[PDB]
Design a protein around this ligand. Structure first.
Ligand SMILES: Nc1ncnc2c1ncn2[C@@H]1O[C@H](COP(=O)(O)OP(=O)(O)OP(=O)(O)O)[C@@H](O)[C@H]1O
Ligand SMILES: Nc1ncnc2c1ncn2[C@@H]1O[C@H](COP(=O)(O)OP(=O)(O)OP(=O)(O)O)[C@@H](O)[C@H]1O
Ligand SMILES: Nc1ncnc2c1ncn2[C@@H]1O[C@H](COP(=O)(O)OP(=O)(O)OP(=O)(O)O)[C@@H](O)[C@H]1O
Ligand SMILES: Nc1ncnc2c1ncn2[C@@H]1O[C@H](COP(=O)(O)OP(=O)(O)OP(=O)(O)O)[C@@H](O)[C@H]1O
Ligand SMILES: Nc1ncnc2c1ncn2[C@@H]1O[C@H](COP(=O)(O)OP(=O)(O)OP(=O)(O)O)[C@@H](O)[C@H]1O
Ligand SMILES: [Mg+2]
Ligand SMILES: [Mg+2]
Ligand SMILES: [Mg+2]
Ligand SMILES: [Mg+2]
Lengths: 4, 868, 4, 348, 4, 176, 4
């Protein structure tokens, strides 16, 4: 999903 | 028979140190207490026919049938409810046999104690034993249907809480190695070790398993790409996105002997391993098409599983699918029945192998081989009943760990490192594991993160391997600790004060120190939680905390009696004193019994550790004969014969002598400091503060701290107002002092009284006594005040008024006038701003001693007078 | 809870 | 720092360093990020349970499996000022932050009902993001949603055009801030505040155009790294250690980051594994922070190498012979020696 | 998924 | 060494020391006057030793440690002349007179006033630092038959770890 | 010489  | 109360104990306790898992039931024998079996016709025959196995129960008689030698000569349902609960658990496979019955309270109330394996199953068996036992003293039997359903519920309760076999394997080895473990509140995780040394596991994943490695291992295209770029042999193959290109793909792959798989990964479904013809490829395709690696060259050989744990090989096993052979000229259905009777085959994990099941999938596998159930096999012909190997479907596993070639060992270890996984299962296809894969034309088919273990710890052929040992060795490397130091402090009076000082001393070494007290839970002076935080639930907060290096825990009898200790064992166990407080509660009526509760701490100290005992206390010094640990002593009298005998055998003791707190180590004396220069002690005038300081200093010393550290710690420690409110708060108001304290049992009134006796000032006034919830010890208090104070005014008419009105004050007046009826014995009753405000009735340098119901008010009112 |  | 790097052939990974000293990264995940920690951080119920059992302040709330029990849940939670979320996690969708009335709870519910944490007490304060890298605090920033203010007696549509011309606003990552976009969701957010596009604001009144903060939607980020109280620093570091994550973003709701959370009645709302960095390296107010330096320091600790020795042999004649001898000599020290020649590639 |  | 102190002996040297003070054996002393019978202190000649370990000023502690390090000696006795050990030497105008390698201990382990000190413990702690062994593993093999064969095999196995292994047998004494 |  990345950069939460 | 009624059940009034149930307790579940989890850890060393009053009833047993070793029997950590116990249920204590408070059973009210409204009936039957008056009828010792002989008075209950039929209650022998009914019991033995319902539960015929109750011959294996022994009681005082050391005999098989020792239980049944009685019963007819009753035990007033002690023993019978106890033995029935234990047997009901045995009948469903849970093994527990410890138990005891003791009468308490008024006649007819008993404490029934029995061992459990599973917590809910244990409580269930207790309730069921009572119903069974009460039916048999009403009628002569118990219907079988009401017995079988209870046994079914116990089997389910004990199934639902079971750990899976891969976790049982790791946990069992952890116990062998003395590594403590706990279950966590989320995601089925298990914690191993305490404080800063803790590790977590979940099945076959651990705190050392990285996410990038695990995700790559689940990506079949990704895995293949990474390994072939490292020079590692993998199958040749391609991609078709559900177009009828099967006939083209074989041109790149190598012709017809190919493998067709669902493109995605959804269990072993839609897979054809050896495609021989075009139309077979289409049928395989139509099944592959069901899901979201589709034409691979087929390689010949056996399916081998290799287990690697820390970049190092642990075990190798060969897997074979369920099959039958031409064991004479018999048919396949006959051969299946012949071998499916093998005693090593059965359901679940109760066997090594399992049963062979004929289903439509067995038929499909046999058709491809040219056989069916009525076919007769040629001698030694083998027919497979399944496409792939699995022990759970009736296949076999052969240990081949010692037959693997050195070059193959090197390659397998390199594969795990390239894909980044610590614990890995590698699937290898080869005809001969004893030859290099490049010579046998073998391939590596799959890399599996977090593999299972049944095939390596319970193989059908070959020797079992201890797989867990290599796992625990990476988590807890040789030479490293799995525990942090635990210093447990108990006794009737002085625990909180001793606990804060000891934590303060350790803190001077720069470590993170966590501790629990009756005021709050702290870590390095930050408050984590407030309120009474003694007991096993709070000890758990500190032990689970990833930052804590040292744990100092005050331990109360409420926690021990209600649920056991939270830690199993410790390094230092300090017992400060035994006194008659809390008697009558928790079924403890005498001082000799109270001593058995306090001794629990001394008896759980590790043999390499120490127990610290008070040599001036005859119940505490006596605990020395139960302790398996080393014993150190402290005292306020250097000539105490115990101390002298002990140091002459080169033991360690701490004594107060010549104005100094000193440690006697064999023949040498180490002086730490002067009592008058240690601020917690009121100028050396409070002997009870000195004794608490000796205990803290000795515990720090025996556990390895240097004397200079101890000196620094005692000198800078404070117990001022609002840090330790209600505990010796002395207020300076011009040429006048007032002391706020909060005694409970009589020892605290005597300890304060000695401070007052040393006050070389003017009048000694006291403005109070006990509340309404004390037992008949009001006279004793009055007797204590009578010889300590020359101004005694009674205010015992508090706001809570637990009993009536001023009767408590009237009893105090009776007591004080009994010993010395010459101290202006006024009773004022009010204690808000009436007696605790009347301080101007005392001359310069006199002392006013306050024993408020509420400390918060006492220390608020004293500030209205503008103290220094 | 109370533990004392 | 002179650390060599390479792209790998799978899953967008990057390799840092050579041989035995290599590390791998992917975006904000690294070779030091454990799987148990990352999975726990993605489980909202699991995270809350683990943190409250450690004495860490979290929001009060409950569960409703799409039954009309909203009116009962508020009895345990604390009345009407509540938060209603989709039960599952599918982006910022179907969420009402401040429910004031029964019928609002139902509308929130009907949207929550679209997915597979449903009534939480609402806490007041600003949304702060805390970045922790190796059990140690690196940066703190305050996030505010896109908004306009009563900068004179102008209307909202006028105020949007006035501020959306700011030179620091634009598309992508070519600017610090981005453009404010009026859409049906801006209208819905303004209606709840009692405003619309032609409304004139009172001086210094603020109107929000979005429910949540995000730089990518036109909000702002303010560096507050040097204003955080020592006790709050201690608590944030303890949270990352309890949930087992090296690089973590912690979402905190508080009215004042300079006071202890227990005094301001603040809470920890979420723990995010593998957080992004734009808000800390390119804030709209305050000074930029070098976030990468603390990451490379854990992967390649001070004093350690990132490279292995390389001995390169060339010339017209004699290379293969020289190469095999030199590899043979190093091998006598017990090290793993790899080499390449015209015949083959070998390791030991 | 476990025990792969 | 059967006592703490020893006997005072009058000799020609006691007479010489007393003459310099204006006294002799038949002289009567004024109340609390002190007369010395020897020029220098020594327990073996009848003098006394008082423990003052806890009265030494932090700056003086620092200086004494620096002196031992400058002259390069581990165990050292330093002779200091001062009117007050509780004040810095620069304020009392004190001096360091002598540094003695390999000093004796009677005056510190058996003082006439003050508490005895365990002087040996700090010595053994430097020779055998905490956490380190003072012994090597010993494997002893006995029995009526088979000792020599068992001994050679066991030594051979340990040797595969790269350690120096010594052993004794009925044939010879060997090391590696 | 010893014991200096
Ligand atoms: N190219 C191949 N040549 C020969 N055997 C193969 C080949 N590919 C897979 N197999 C074997 O066929 C089976 C297919 O399993 P696969 O590798 O597809 O893993 P999976 O999807 O996890 O399924 P499973 O759970 O049945 O192992 C395994 O027993 C494997 O050893
Ligand atoms: N060693 C002692 N012997 C007798 N009385 C003591 C001793 N130490 C303290 N006291 C008195 O008893 C009081 C109890 O204080 P403290 O908080 O230390 O008790 P505790 O036993 O730790 O706590 P609790 O009863 O709340 O579990 C003190 O304020 C003092 O008056
Ligand atoms: N109980 C609460 N009280 C106040 N604000 C809250 C509460 N719960 C969440 N919020 C805030 O509302 C927003 C909701 O985000 P949430 O915590 O649901 O995470 P999410 O599902 O990842 O969504 P998003 O991507 O929008 O953050 C965040 O800005 C959060 O700070
Ligand atoms: N130093 C040298 N000078 C001249 N000739 C040499 C030298 N060393 C080797 N040779 C000759 O040249 C040949 C080349 O062998 P070698 O494999 O070592 O060459 P290379 O330069 O490494 O390889 P290539 O030309 O295949 O890249 C040797 O067999 C020998 O006959
Ligand atoms: N375990 C044994 N039990 C009985 N006889 C043995 C055993 N081992 C060896 N022997 C026999 O006894 C002989 C004694 O040989 P060895 O040198 O090992 O004996 P020893 O007991 O070590 O020596 P010694 O008697 O010289 O002290 C061997 O050569 C063999 O014949
Ligand atoms: Mg206490
Ligand atoms: Mg108590
Ligand atoms: Mg060459
Ligand atoms: Mg011999």
């Amino acid at each position: 999903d990345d950069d939460d | 028979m009624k059940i009034l109360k149930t307790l579940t104990l989890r850890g060393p306790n009053y009833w047993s140190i070793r029997r950590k898992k116990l249920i204590v039931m408070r059973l009210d024998l409204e009936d039957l207490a008056e009828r010792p079996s002989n008075s209950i016709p039929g209650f022998y025959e009914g019991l033995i026919k319902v539960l015929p196995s109750l011959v294996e129960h022994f009681c005082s008689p050391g005999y098989q049938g020792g239980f049944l030698e009685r019963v007819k000569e009753g035990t007033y349902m002690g023993h019978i409810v106890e033995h029935v609960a234990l047997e009901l658990q045995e009948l469903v496979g849970m093994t527990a046999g410890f138990g005891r019955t003791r009468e308490t309270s008024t006649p007819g109330v008993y404490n029934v104690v029995y061992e459990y394996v599973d917590e809910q199953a244990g409580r269930y068996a207790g309730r069921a034993a009572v119903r069974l036992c009460r039916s048999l003293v009403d009628t002569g039997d118990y219907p079988r249907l009401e017995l079988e359903k209870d046994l079914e519920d116990l089997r389910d309760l004990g199934a639902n809480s079971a750990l899976g076999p891969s976790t049982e394997t790791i946990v069992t080895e952890a116990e062998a190695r003395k590594i403590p473990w706990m279950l966590l509140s989320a995601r089925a995780m298990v914690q191993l070790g305490y404080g800063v040394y803790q590790q977590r596991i979940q099945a076959t994943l651990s705190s050392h398993s990285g996410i990038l490695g695990v995700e790559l291992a689940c990506d079949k295209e990704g895995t293949k790409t990474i390994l072939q770029d490292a020079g590692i042999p993998v199958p040749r193959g391609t991609t078709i996105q559900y177009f009828d290109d099967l006939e083209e793909a074989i041109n790149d792959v190598g012709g017809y002997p190919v493998v067709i798989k669902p493109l995605d990964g959804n269990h072993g479904r839609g897979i054809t391993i050896n495609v021989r013809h075009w139309q077979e490829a289409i049928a395989a395709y139509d099944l592959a098409a069901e899901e979201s690696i589709i034409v691979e060259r087929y390689y010949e050989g056996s399916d081998h599983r290799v287990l690697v744990v820390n970049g190092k090989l642990v075990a190798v096993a060969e897997r074979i699918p369920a099959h039958v052979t031409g064991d004479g000229s018999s048919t396949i259905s006959e051969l299946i029945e012949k071998t499916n009777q093998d005693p090593n085959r059965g359901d679940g994990h109760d066997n090594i192998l399992t049963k062979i099941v004929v289903n439509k999938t067995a038929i499909d596998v046999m058709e491809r081989q040219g056989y069916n159930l009525d076919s007769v096999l040629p001698k030694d012909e083998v027919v497979y009943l399944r496409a792939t190997a699995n022990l759970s479907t009736g296949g076999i596993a052969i240990d081949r760990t010692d037959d693997i070639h050195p070059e193959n060992i090197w390659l397998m270890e390199r594969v795990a490192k390239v894909i980044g996984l610590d614990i890995a299962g590698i699937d290898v296809v080869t005809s001969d594991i004893s030859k290099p894969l490049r010579e046998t034309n073998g391939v590596i088919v799959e890399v599996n993160a977090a593999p299972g273990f049944r095939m390596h710890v319970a193989p059908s052929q070959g020797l079992p391997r201890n797989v867990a040992a290599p796992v625990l060795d990476m988590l807890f490397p040789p030479g490293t600790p799995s525990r942090i130091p635990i210093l447990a402090v108990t006794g009737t009076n002085g625990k909180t004060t001793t606990t804060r000082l000891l934590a303060h001393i350790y803190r001077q070494t720069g470590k993170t120190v966590g501790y629990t007290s009756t005021d709050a839970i702290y870590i390095n002076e930050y408050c984590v939680e407030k309120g009474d935080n003694t007991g096993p639930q709070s000890a758990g907060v500190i032990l689970r905390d990833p930052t804590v290096e040292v744990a100092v825990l005050e331990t109360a009898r409420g926690g021990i009696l209600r649920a056991g200790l939270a830690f199993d064992s410790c390094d230092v166990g300090v017992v400060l004193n035994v006194a008659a407080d809390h008697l009558g509660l928790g079924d403890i009526d005498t001082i000799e019994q109270m001593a058995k509760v306090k001794s629990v701490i001394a008896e759980v100290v590790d043999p390499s550790g120490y127990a610290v005992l008070n040599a001036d206390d005859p119940l505490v010094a006596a605990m020395a004969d139960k302790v398996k640990a080393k014993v150190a002593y402290f005292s306020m009298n250097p000539d105490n014969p115990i101390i002298q005998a002990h140091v002459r055998r080169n033991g360690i003791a701490a004594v107060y002598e010549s104005g100094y707190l000193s440690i006697l180590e064999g023949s040498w004396t180490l002086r730490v400091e002067q009592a008058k220069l240690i601020p917690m002690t009121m100028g050396g005038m409070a002997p009870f503060m000195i004794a608490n300081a000796l205990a803290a200093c000795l515990a720090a010393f025996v556990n390895g701290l240097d004397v200079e550290v101890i000196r620094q710690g005692v000198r800078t420690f404070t117990t001022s107002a609002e840090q330790t409110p209600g505990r010796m708060n002395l207020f300076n108001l011009g040429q006048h002092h007032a002391l706020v304290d909060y005694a409970h049992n009589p020892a605290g009134y005597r300890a304060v009284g000695d401070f007052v006796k040393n006050w070389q000032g003017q009048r000694f006034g006291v403005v109070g006594g006990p509340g309404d919830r004390r037992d008949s010890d009001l006279i004793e208090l009055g007797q204590i005040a009578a010889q300590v104070f020359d101004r005694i005014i009674v205010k015992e008419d508090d706001d809570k008024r637990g009993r009536s009105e001023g009767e408590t004050a009237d009893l105090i007046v009776k007591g004080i006038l009994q010993e010395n009826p010459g101290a202006s014995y006024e009773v004022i009753l009010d204690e808000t701003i009436a007696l605790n405000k009347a301080l101007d009735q005392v001359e310069e340098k006199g002392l006013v001693v306050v024993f408020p119901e509420s400390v918060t008010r006492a220390i608020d009112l004293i500030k209205v007078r503008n103290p220094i | 809870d109370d533990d004392n």
